[PDB]
């Protein structure tokens, strides 16, 4: 409906967003930031306001410099699996930084968009304080925490489950209303967040 909302705020990401040295998909790169774009504005004014820069990567996570002290470490859960934070393709909390090609879900992570629920992790941590670790969400955790599936993770962790919420609510029209099918209350707890 609104396409002036979107310019703006890939104004104001152009103020968080950083483009990395070295070769990548142009393109793609341009269609994270269109996706992000679609995250309210007062979200995005508060994550610039912050300071807050989203590093989108050419290559993987722990190639650059501040996340090398992740190279060769096991994330948590990653029982067995082969894989180390060398092949995770997303962060999101303090430091955003996001690998270029694998934002749809399954490009080595679970999550239906890796831009988007990464930011929210930092939206959670930085510009809200840690409300998916308030007593109100919890509450909700309490009762639609698994309704998105992954049940033993985002069933789990409150933070995880609000990041996906998150992203189901800011993604695409139809990801938003599956959202309010099977998270009443998240998708409410949400829609008043940025009222
Ligand atoms: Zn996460």
Redesign the pocket.
């Known amino acids: 409906m609104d396409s002036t909302t979107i310019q703006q705020n890939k104004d104001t990401l152009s103020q968080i967003v950083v483009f990395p040295t070295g070769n990548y998909d142009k393109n793609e790169a341009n269609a994270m930031v269109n996706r992000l774009a679609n995250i309210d504005g007062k979200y995005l004014n508060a994550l610039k306001q912050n300071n807050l820069k989203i590093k989108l990567l050419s290559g993987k996570l722990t190639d650059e410099k501040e996340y090398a002290y992740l190279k060769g470490v096991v994330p948590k859960g990653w029982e067995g699996t082969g894989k180390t934070w060398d092949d995770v393709p997303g962060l999101?909390g303090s430091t955003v930084a996001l690998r270029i090609g694998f934002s749809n879900k399954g490009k080595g992570h679970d999550?239906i968009n890796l831009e988007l629920?990464?930011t929210?992790?930092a939206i959670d941590h930085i510009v809200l304080n840690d409300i998916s670790k308030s007593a109100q969400f919890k509450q909700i955790f309490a009762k639609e925490g698994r309704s998105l599936g992954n049940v033993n993770y985002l069933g789990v962790y409150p933070?995880?489950f609000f990041?996906?919420s998150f992203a189901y609510y800011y993604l695409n029209q139809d990801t938003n209303s599956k959202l309010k099918s099977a998270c009443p209350q998240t998708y409410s707890f949400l829609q008043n967040l940025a009222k």
């Open positions: 999101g999550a629920h990464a929210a992790h933070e995880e990041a996906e």
